[PDB]
């Protein structure tokens, strides 16, 4: 009960913090995995042991903020430290913070490999990833016309490190064709009842060879005239799950019900027949728009809000990126993509660059701008422990059932520590 987050200000160092805090700086460097022959950058957010039930604030934090994180009453938190509940704090100021209660989460992370074989790199995150999961999603089983699936490489292998992790393996089946997602593909699989008697017999030998409890279908890019005929083979998959199995689907974000794309993600149906949803909760910013913030905390609360409306609160499992983009300015059409990044090379560009981190409270972002050496100005967001520590608090206050993540090989080691911290991670294996 003695981590809390810190801002990096001017000055700071591995050695400064620790002696500030009375830690080590060995501590500070392999809670961040820093380099730890790095500077730091100002506006950096780490993980810091403070003592126990011992509290400095930071910039915004409010008491019903730090009750939220901390998961303790805000009338004890303000009555502990003679306190009002809305009493203004400033930076520094030093709390007392008792023992909370952490409520269950239910964890997921997605794999998506590049190359085969997988990349050693991509294996190792997977194995240090692993013991924070409930599931692990391996992206993915392709589905065919002829009612077979398409199995990724070393499916054995990764399905194994989740089950000798109690981790639960998701089989995830996809409607990509050539790399695409097919409305075609499902139309066939959706409408042709002898194929789809063969699809489920299939999927139901591929979960029991692999042990893939839960059976994951990510079907995007549906027609919106094949939206019952998804809820019906949604149907007839779940009366055919045997016991000890789940099923479960990814829908795209949504804040109403009739917001043609969108049709075929029926929330209402699917709620009634699946044992959870991955909500895409990410992607406002996006590699092919402009820079902006990846997942901004308003827009998601409206889908988990709009979420709830149409299905149990225990069911939705909110989506969370784990990159960040750099875009290249200005924004043009035809520009080039923006480049993918981890937390840690996020941070890595602004110490490249001499730039401090900045953070907008009301996306609840990171974020900063550079110029590069030929003279371009770049603009990053991405995701830090401080925006994370906000989301994990969304989830708290809107009871949802947990957090899915995309995607492992992104390094970003103070979510997985937060995540332990701030929850008791399910594990049903």
Do not use: C
């Amino acid at each position: 009960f003695a981590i809390q987050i810190v801002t990096v200000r001017s000055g700071d160092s591995v050695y400064s913090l620790a002696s500030k805090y009375g830690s080590t700086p060995d501590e500070i460097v392999k809670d961040n995995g820093l380099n730890p022959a790095e500077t730091l950058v100002v506006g950096q957010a780490l993980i810091v042991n403070t003592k126990g039930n011992n509290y400095y604030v930071q910039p915004g934090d409010s008491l019903y903020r730090i009750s939220q994180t901390y998961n303790v009453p805000l009338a004890s938190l303000a009555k502990v430290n003679n306190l009002s509940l809305k009493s203004i704090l400033h930076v520094g100021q030093q709390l007392y913070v008792p023992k909370g209660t952490k409520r269950s989460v239910e964890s997921i992370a997605y794999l998506q490999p590049s190359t085969i074989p997988i990349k050693e790199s991509l294996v190792n995150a997977t194995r240090a990833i692993n013991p924070f999961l409930t599931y692990l999603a391996y992206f993915s089983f392709e589905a065919k016309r002829d009612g077979t699936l398409k199995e990724p490489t070393e499916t054995a292998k990764i399905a194994n490190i989740a089950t000798q992790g109690q981790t639960i393996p998701m089989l995830v089946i996809t409607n990509i064709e050539n790399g695409n997602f097919s409305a075609d593909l499902t139309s066939v699989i959706l409408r042709d009842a002898t194929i789809q008697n063969k699809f489920i017999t299939n999927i139901l030998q591929t979960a029991e060879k692999y042990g893939m409890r839960d059976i994951h279908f990510d079907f995007e890019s549906v027609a919106p005239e094949d939206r019952e005929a998804y809820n019906r083979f949604l149907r007839n998959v779940k009366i055919r799950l045997p016991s000890g199995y789940t099923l479960s689907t990814t829908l795209v974000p949504k804040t109403s019900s009739n917001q043609k794309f969108f049709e075929a993600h029926d929330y209402k149906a699917q709620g009634q027949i699946v044992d959870f949803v991955v909500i895409m909760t990410y992607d406002w910013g996006w590699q092919g728009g402009p820079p902006m913030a990846i997942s901004p905390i308003g827009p998601v609360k409206e889908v988990l809000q709009y979420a709830k409306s149409q299905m149990p609160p225990q069911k939705i499992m909110m989506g969370q990126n784990l990159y960040g983009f750099d875009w290249k300015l200005p924004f043009k059409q035809g520009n080039p993509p923006a480049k993918a990044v981890s937390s840690v090379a996020a941070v890595a560009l602004a110490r490249k660059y001499n730039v401090p981190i900045r953070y907008d409270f009301t996306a609840q972002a990171p974020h900063f701008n550079y110029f590069d050496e030929n003279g371009v100005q770049h603009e990053v967001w991405f995701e830090d422990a401080r925006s994370i520590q906000s989301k994990f608090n969304l989830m708290k206050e809107q009871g949802i059932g947990g957090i899915s993540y995309w995607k492992i090989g992104l390094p970003f080691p103070q979510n997985w520590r937060l995540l332990v911290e701030n929850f008791t991670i399910t594990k049903k294996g």
